[PDB]
RNA sequence: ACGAAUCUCUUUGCCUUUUGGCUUAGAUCAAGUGUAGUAUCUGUUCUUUUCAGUGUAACAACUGAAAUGACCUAGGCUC
């Protein structure tokens, strides 16, 4: 589906979701010229665009490549996307998808760079919660029981799972961020203590704000 | 100029491919244990049910799991509640307990035993799991060539043996009982 | 000579553990047998990918589709379906 | 010695011949050698054939 | 076709400076401005490629003898046939008399080349066609001109008149 | 294709293809020159290529 | 008991003796890493 | 690590300018240990040291090129998933031509750098550099490329599957299930 | 070992017991020999866990081991924690040659 | 000259090297470092050539097998390394032809070091392959001293394999079981 | 063994196939892999028997130059590395050490990486297909891309005005030929002072001129 | 031709810190090793005409054996 006039969202049959943007070199040409002029030969392309075509003829047919914007392993085959201008009178657009196995999910754009920074920090301490809890248990037995992978139950690294076929690019997983809500207050304060200036009550406020306000 | 996304799962998937019965956790009783409870799983989530009153009651939904669950079977050790043996795409054997902890019913890992590397490989012994009906051993099998057997025991703590191994270089396993 | 001797000795251990390694004299017959057997494991193995293939083939159950993908690893399976 | 230099790593080089030398004693071996001589005898001809 | 020549360049001119002047004329694709790589000094000229032949011929017409760079005036400028060996010629035969003989069978792309062997006068005569030179071999071979016997055959490259040589010269004449 | 001319070096035989003379035997035959023909020597085999071109 | 003189050490001696002279052998030894003052004199 | 890399790194990037080999190799080695010690904090510094790794990868000395790809190993592992693919695509372009090296310390450092780049880039985009060499006519081309394929295969047997260059014309036994549309 | 190319790892299927390092080898990754950021404990196979040898260090093979061995973060990111038993079986020519020159 | 000899070994004959190298290992004047360096040269020579004849397999066992009973454990480990490298080089058919009269020998010393060497051969090539050779020696109504060593081979197999001996327990028990009533 | 023209007919890009591709053990498999979309060719110095990066081009390699954002820390003036102290004075500096040899501003050092240059990127970053080869000069290429952007028809810089002997305010000396031949074909929309633009616009360094939605989820 | 100036160039002559001092040369004192492996000069050697096999991406290299006389103007349906 088209997100804009330069960016498209899509999915494949291996369980991945991704967005692709036309590069700004491409978008300047397509704005300042008529569509017939691409067919004519009356476009002055830069010399490095001309020389990659002679050098890589199987690769550079169209003269431009897409820029991978976002990538995420959702582990379900997505059969529809629905692009919505708002959801229940919220500000943001959302784009909700449906999977073949019965999933409904959404991708919400984050609009503030400070919102992006706070939610990245919540996802990060939830991601190394195995590492943080296990190394604390090992240090007490040095100088005074937790299995490896006790917070993740199965023992799987969360980044590796969401990077199954390709790296994650600029998606924050909210499902990982909502497992913070299920933790007990002792465990919540052990995870939050590395973050500076941020309290447990401010983390829970930030997580809850997505489902009340943003959709 | 970039695009920063936030992902949520509004409704979870409903392709339940694993099921196992037993008595996993005590609910509302002092010492009443009956094999009426039921745990179903998709690839990514686990749901516990109760069938004592003649109908499917949902007891508990659990946290978000980030792995691909490939096998799930009940484990009843001779002379306890029932455990869950799981095998996912992390390359490990997990034995798990359902406990009550600070208000809520939750998952608790007891054993994580490393097998081979992660993801769905044909050499990874995660496709077929079969448990001895007396509770003595877990039999794990890959799609191609590998079979593992773990002797599981309980004395003050759940304990697994080092594995027993079959390597059959070209055999593609189709079923196992 | 000893650094070259490790990488020879480790190529054998990794080829036994993981089937589809090669070197320089791998035939296209050997390489393509690896690519096919890996791909059929994936289609069988991920459960969304099972349902996608079983529905679009129009098979009668999803388990009939799993045994079709696992018997297809055999080189003598095209001739088995042809001798019915 | 109009051809001996130090590069951007401080190693001694001959620009005529594109050689590299570990010390100054290797430079003296080079300049008394026959490869450096044939390269002088080519810059001689390529200057005597075009003014 | 796309490239023009620029001459009379003071080697204080760099590649950056050359590009300024020539985009006032037309948009420029590439510049190659050669250098003796030992003395690191340009040799007084550049090859400058434009996008098409229309912008090229415009640049020659506008910029030739127009601009002075370090008081030096910039120049801008643009940038198989049948062979019969004849042995034992008469020596009374001129190179203009070879043309008078051989025009009746075939058109001459060049003039003939009289060279002396052994005393022995011989000539390389050039024809525009493989078949019109055959008429010279058909009618003039072992014939008596200026009271001397001349022999006409193919000249050597072994000799001309191959089956691959018959095919391609037919296409070249097309 | 170039009158069965011999070349005494394999660097020179590769550089042959983008020269004025090999351009000529191709272009007079009915084959417009480019890298797609920076190959073969035979008169015949460049005709089955260009009729696919 | 070695006392092996490589030819670069011979070049360092002759250049070193050209500078320090013939009576300052401890300067001549200061340029050699592996030779003594009596070894250089000899 | 203890005082902050913003205090240290402008001084050691300046020091790389000096024309001495052991100082330049000491700067690149000190930069390797920095990115092992600071783990995920590396990502704040990727763009600033990408012109210095370009100076070391395009140099004649193998030790310069050993030590540059040892930095790339630590960098690519700690910053995959953070959005810096254009830095690593650039670094992949300068590291791929050293695949034919024969020296044992240099080629094990170059191969470990290639393994970490295929996590920064992903197996599907990394493998576009590798397909052509697998069935090359020359044997030396074919030894060097199968040694990279075998590292990639041990890391991604299942994940390589969407990216194989197999078509029905190319592959006799091509799985007809891949062409089905639901 | 990353450094000595004649050392030979076991790489058998890992068991349930843990491999130990000595005081000289303490804090080292068995794979890459890195001193920093440990992630997961090392499991050795059945045969490497039997008898008098099981108490010995799994890197240097002679001294008695005291603390547990860990894979580092970067070997766990690469999957090298899953390849097999990381115990060195031979002693290696570096160790051997010092032993016989000295007495 | 160690690295030269490893490279020139394949072009020299194996006959030429072991005719000269092996007699040094038998003199009474030899020092501890001199013994080690020549045992080390054998081990580097054996790896490359790989096709080793039955008269030379015997001569190597004469010098290699008494290392297995040396006082210090460093020398005993280098004895085990040669015999396992010679096991893969010579193969199973050749070494058993060599070791067979050496068990029937009248000297107690030779029967001691042959029993120990054959169990290194068993760990290299598998006890299942060595089981009929051992089963013949443990029965062997011809020679009484051949029975005694066939049981010592089994005992050294137990020491070498450790808990690995359970895979072969039924074969190794079947070999020895009647000998308790001898 | 197939011939070269035989092999070129099987593919969509026959310019990718070369003569040694017919010596492959499987030329038909090799040639279709090479013509697959996005497959990058093998680095081309495989044929050569010299050594990667051993050519003459490495003699002209310059020293490292810091990114221009880092030059703002002023470390280049405080430690000079491009071309001292005796052994006694170095020995005396260990027992009486001098402090504050570097006068670096710590707030300026942090703000280089994190405030001034949080969005800093290098000007050249090789794209997807751009594999590095030995005689490639990346310095020329960033100079050339920057030469195309800043420099425009319709302005002439002061450096060229000294060379051309054409000061400001003045028609350039091909003005008359464009009165006789005409306007440039490659600039349809160029307006030149004195031919199709007003002569009082002929002003300083300028004599001519070309006169001819937000993205989803953009950051506020 | 010469009286004759002025610039360029060589030869001859001129000439520069061509050692701060002194004594018992004022006195004394100076380089770790082992295991693996790279890079980089120089000297030295390629006296061969075909063919066959091996070898290579193609070469090369390696292993085997054996070719000379006549004439005409680089060339020979030459003997
Ligand atoms: Zn030179
Ligand atoms: Zn041609
Ligand atoms: Zn082990
Ligand atoms: Zn140790
Ligand atoms: Zn490690």
UniProtKB/Swiss-Prot annotation, chain C:
* Chief location bin: nucleus
Gene Ontology CC, one term: nucleus
Per UniProt, which keywords does this protein have? Answer: mRNA processing, mRNA splicing, Nucleus
Q: Name one Pfam family in it.
A: SF3b10
**One Gene Ontology term from the biological process aspect of the record:** mRNA splicing, via spliceosome
Compartments (UniProt record):
Nucleus
InterPro entries assigned: SF3b5/RDS3-10 (IPR009846)
Q: Does the keyword Phosphoprotein apply?
A: no
Q: What does this protein do?
A: Involved in pre-mRNA splicing. Required for the SF3b integrity and prespliceosome assembly.
Q: What does the subunit comment say?
A: Belongs to the SF3b complex composed of CUS1, HSH49, HSH155, RCP1, RDS3 and RSE1.
* Record's protein name: RDS3 complex subunit 10
What species does this protein belong to? Answer: Saccharomyces cerevisiae (strain ATCC 204508 / S288c) (Baker's yeast)
UniProtKB/Swiss-Prot annotation, chain G:
State the DNA-binding region(s). Answer: 25-42
* Ranges for domain HTH myb-type: 1-42
Q: Where in the cell is it found?
A: Cytoplasm; Nucleus
Per the record, the similarity remark reads: Belongs to the CEF1 family.
Q: What else is known?
A: Present with 784 molecules/cell in log phase SD medium.
Q: How does it assemble?
A: Belongs to the NTC complex (or PRP19-associated complex), composed of at least CEF1, CLF1, ISY1, NTC20, SNT309, SYF1, SYF2, and PRP19.
User: What is the stated purpose of this protein?
Assistant: Involved in pre-mRNA splicing and cell cycle control. Required for the binding of the NTC complex (or PRP19-associated complex) components to the spliceosome to mediate conformational rearrangement or to stabilize the structure of the spliceosome after U4 snRNA dissociation, which leads to spliceosome maturation. Its absence leads to an arrest of the cell cycle, possibly due to the inefficient splicing of TUB1.
Please identify the protein, giving its name as recorded.
Pre-mRNA-splicing factor CEF1
Q: Which organism is it from?
A: Saccharomyces cerevisiae (strain ATCC 204508 / S288c)
Supply the source organism's classification.
Eukaryota, Fungi, Dikarya, Ascomycota, Saccharomycotina
What gene, per UniProt, encodes this protein?
Answer: CEF1
């Amino acid at each position: 589906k088209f997100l804009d006039e330069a960016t498209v969202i899509g999915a494949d049959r291996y369980g991945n979701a991704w967005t692709l943007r036309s590069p700004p070199e491409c978008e300047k040409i397509m704005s300042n010229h008529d569509p017939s002029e691409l067919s004519n030969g009356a476009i002055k392309y830069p010399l490095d665009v001309i020389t990659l075509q002679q050098k890589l003829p199987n690769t550079y047919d169209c003269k431009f490549k897409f820029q991978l914007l976002n990538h995420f392993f959702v582990n379900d085959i997505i059969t529809d996307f629905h692009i919505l201008d708002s959801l229940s009178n919220s500000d943001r657009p959302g784009c909700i998808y449906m999977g073949l196995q019965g999933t409904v999910g959404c991708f919400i754009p984050l609009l503030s760079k400070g919102n992006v920074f706070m939610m990245g920090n919540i996802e990060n301490i939830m991601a190394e919660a195995d590492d943080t809890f296990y190394l604390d248990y090992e240090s007490r037995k040095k100088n005074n029981i937790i299995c490896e992978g006790s917070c993740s139950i199965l023992g799987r690294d969360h980044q590796e799972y969401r990077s199954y076929y390709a790296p994650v690019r600029k998606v924050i997983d909210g499902d990982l961020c909502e497992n913070f809500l299920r933790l007990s207050l002792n465990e919540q304060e052990f995870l939050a203590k590395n973050l500076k200036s941020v309290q447990v009550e401010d983390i829970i406020q930030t997580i809850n704000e997505v489902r009340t306000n943003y959709m | 100029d970039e695009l920063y996304l936030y992902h949520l799962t509004l409704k979870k998937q409903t392709n339940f491919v694993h099921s196992c019965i037993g008595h996993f956790v005590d609910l509302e009783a002092g010492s009443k244990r009956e094999q009426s409870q039921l745990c179903v799983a998709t690839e990514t989530h686990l749901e516990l049910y109760d069938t004592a009153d003649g109908e499917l009651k949902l007891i508990a939904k659990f946290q978000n799991l980030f792995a691909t669950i490939t096998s799930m079977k009940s484990l009843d050790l001779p002379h306890w509640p029932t455990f869950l043996a799981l095998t996912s795409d992390s390359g490990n054997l997990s034995i798990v307990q359902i406990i009550m902890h600070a208000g809520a019913l939750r998952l608790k890992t007891l054993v994580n035993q490393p097998l081979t590397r992660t993801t769905l490989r044909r050499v990874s012994p995660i496709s077929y799991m079969e448990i001895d009906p007396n509770g003595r051993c877990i039999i794990l099998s890959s799609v191609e060539q590998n079979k593992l057997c773990f002797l599981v025991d309980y004395a003050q703590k759940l304990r697994i043996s080092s594995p027993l191994e079959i390597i059959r270089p070209h055999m593609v396993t189709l079923d196992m009982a | 000579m000893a650094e070259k001797q490790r990488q020879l000795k480790l190529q054998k251990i990794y080829k036994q553990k993981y089937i589809g390694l090669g070197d320089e004299s791998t035939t296209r017959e050997q390489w393509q047998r690896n690519v096919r057997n890996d791909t059929l494991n994936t289609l069988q193995g991920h459960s969304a990918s099972l349902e996608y293939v079983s529905l679009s083939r129009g098979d009668l159950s999803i388990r009939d589709t799993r045994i079709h993908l696992l018997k297809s690893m055999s080189p003598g399976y095209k001739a088995y379906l042809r001798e019915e | 010695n109009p051809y001996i230099y130090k590069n951007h790593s401080g190693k001694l080089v001959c620009k005529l011949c594109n050689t590299m030398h570990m010390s100054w004693s290797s430079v003296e071996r080079h300049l008394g050698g026959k490869k450096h001589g044939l390269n002088v005898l080519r810059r001689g001809i390529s200057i005597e054939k075009s003014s | 076709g796309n490239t023009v020549y620029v001459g009379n360049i003071d080697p204080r001119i760099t590649k950056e400076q050359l590009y300024e002047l020539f985009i006032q004329i037309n948009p420029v694709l590439r510049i190659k401005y050669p250098k003796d790589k030992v003395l690191q000094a340009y040799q007084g000229y550049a090859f400058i490629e434009f996008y098409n032949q229309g912008d090229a011929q415009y640049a020659i017409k506008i910029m030739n003898n127009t601009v002075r760079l370090y008081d030096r005036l910039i120049k801008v400028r643009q940038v198989p046939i049948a062979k019969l060996f004849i042995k034992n010629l008469a020596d009374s035969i001129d190179s203009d008399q070879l043309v008078k003989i051989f025009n009746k069978f075939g058109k001459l792309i060049r003039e003939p080349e009289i060279f002396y062997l052994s005393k022995l006068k011989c000539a390389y005569v050039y024809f525009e066609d493989f078949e019109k030179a055959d008429l010279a071999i058909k009618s003039l071979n072992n014939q008596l001109v200026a009271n001397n016997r001349i022999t006409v055959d193919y000249a050597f490259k072994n000799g001309k008149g191959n089956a691959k040589y018959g095919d391609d010269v037919d296409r070249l004449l097309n | 294709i170039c009158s069965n001319k011999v070349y005494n070096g394999r660097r020179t035989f590769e550089r042959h293809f983008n020269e004025e003379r090999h351009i000529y035997h191709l272009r007079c035959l009915g084959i417009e020159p480019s890298s797609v023909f920076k190959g073969i020597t035979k008169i015949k085999e460049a005709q089955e290529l260009w009729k696919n071109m | 008991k070695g006392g092996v003189w490589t030819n670069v050490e011979d070049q360092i001696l002759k250049a070193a003796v050209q500078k320090y002279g013939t009576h300052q052998w401890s300067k001549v030894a200061s340029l050699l890493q592996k030779k003594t003052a009596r070894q250089s004199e000899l | 690590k203890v005082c902050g890399p913003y205090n240290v790194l402008p001084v050691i990037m300046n020091e790389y300018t000096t024309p001495e080999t052991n100082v330049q190799n000491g700067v690149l080695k000190a930069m390797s240990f920095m990115f092992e010690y600071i783990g995920n904090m590396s990502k704040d510094y990727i763009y600033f040291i990408t012109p210095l790794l370009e100076d070391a990868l395009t140099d004649r000395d193998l030790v310069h090129r050993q030590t540059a790809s040892n930095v790339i190993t630590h960098l690519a592992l700690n910053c995959s998933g953070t959005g810096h693919e254009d830095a690593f695509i650039h670094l992949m372009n300068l590291l791929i031509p050293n695949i034919f090296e024969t020296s044992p310390h240099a080629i094990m450092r170059i191969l470990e750098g290639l393994e970490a780049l295929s996590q920064a880039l992903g197996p599907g985009l990394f493998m576009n550099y590798i397909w052509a060499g697998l069935f090359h006519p020359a044997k030396n081309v074919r030894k060097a490329f199968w040694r990279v394929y075998n590292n990639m295969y041990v890391m991604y047997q299942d994940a390589m599957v969407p990216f194989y260059p197999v078509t029905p014309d190319n592959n006799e036994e091509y799985i007809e299930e891949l062409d089905l549309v639901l | 070992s990353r450094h000595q190319f004649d050392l030979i790892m076991c790489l058998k299927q890992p068991g349930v017991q843990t491999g130990l390092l000595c005081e000289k080898c303490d804090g080292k990754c068995p794979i890459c020999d890195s001193y920093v950021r440990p992630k997961r404990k090392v499991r050795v196979c059945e045969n490497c866990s039997f008898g008098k040898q099981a108490k010995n260090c799994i890197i240097c093979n002679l001294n008695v081991g005291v603390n547990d061995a860990f894979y580092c973060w970067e070997c766990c990111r690469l999957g090298k924690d899953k390849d097999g038993c990381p115990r060195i079986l031979n002693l290696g020519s570096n160790r051997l040659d010092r032993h016989f020159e000295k007495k | 000259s160690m690295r030269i000899l490893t490279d020139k070994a394949v072009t020299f004959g194996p006959e030429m090297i072991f005719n000269r190298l092996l007699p040094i290992l038998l003199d009474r004047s030899l020092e501890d470092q001199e013994r080690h360096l020549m045992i080390k040269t054998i081990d580097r020579v054996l790896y490359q050539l790989g096709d080793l004849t039955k008269p030379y397999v015997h001569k190597i066992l004469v010098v290699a097998a008494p290392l297995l009973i040396d006082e210090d454990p460093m020398v005993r480990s280098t004895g085990q390394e040669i015999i396992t490298n010679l096991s893969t080089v010579a193969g199973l058919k050749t070494i058993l032809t060599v070791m067979r009269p050496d068990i029937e020998n009248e000297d107690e010393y030779v029967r001691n070091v042959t029993s120990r060497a054959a169990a290194v051969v068993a760990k290299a090539l598998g006890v299942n392959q060595l089981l009929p050779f051992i089963n013949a020696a443990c029965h062997s109504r011809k020679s009484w001293k051949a029975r005694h060593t066939g049981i010592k081979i089994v005992q050294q197999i137990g020491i070498l394999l450790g808990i690995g001996v359970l895979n072969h327990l039924t074969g190794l028990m079947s070999c020895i079981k009647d000998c308790l009533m001898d | 063994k197939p011939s070269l023209s035989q092999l070129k007919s099987q593919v969509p890009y026959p310019q990718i196939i070369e003569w040694y591709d017919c010596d492959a053990r499987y030329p038909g498999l090799l040639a279709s892999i090479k013509c697959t979309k996005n497959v990058i060719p093998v680095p081309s110095h495989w044929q050569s028997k010299k050594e990667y990066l051993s050519g003459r081009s490495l003699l002209g390699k310059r020293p490292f130059e810091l990114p221009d954002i880092i030059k703002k820390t002023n470390i280049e003036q405080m430690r000079s590395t491009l071309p001292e102290k005796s052994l006694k004075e170095a020995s005396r500096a260990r027992v009486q050490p001098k402090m504050g040899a570097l006068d670096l501003d710590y707030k300026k050092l942090h703000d280089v990486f994190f405030k001034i240059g949080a969005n800093w990127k290098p000007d050249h970053l090789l794209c997807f297909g751009d594999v590095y080869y030995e005689n490639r000069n990346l310095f020329e290429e960033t100079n050339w891309k920057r030469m195309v952007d800043h420099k425009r028809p319709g302005r002439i810089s002061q450096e060229l005005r000294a060379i051309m002997n054409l000061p400001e305010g003045q028609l350039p000396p091909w003005c008359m030929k464009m009165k006789d031949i005409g306007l440039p074909t490659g600039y349809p929309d160029l307006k030149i002072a004195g031919l199709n633009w007003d002569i009082t616009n002929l002003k300083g360094d300028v004599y001519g001129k070309i006169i001819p939605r937000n993205y989803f989820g953009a950051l506020i």
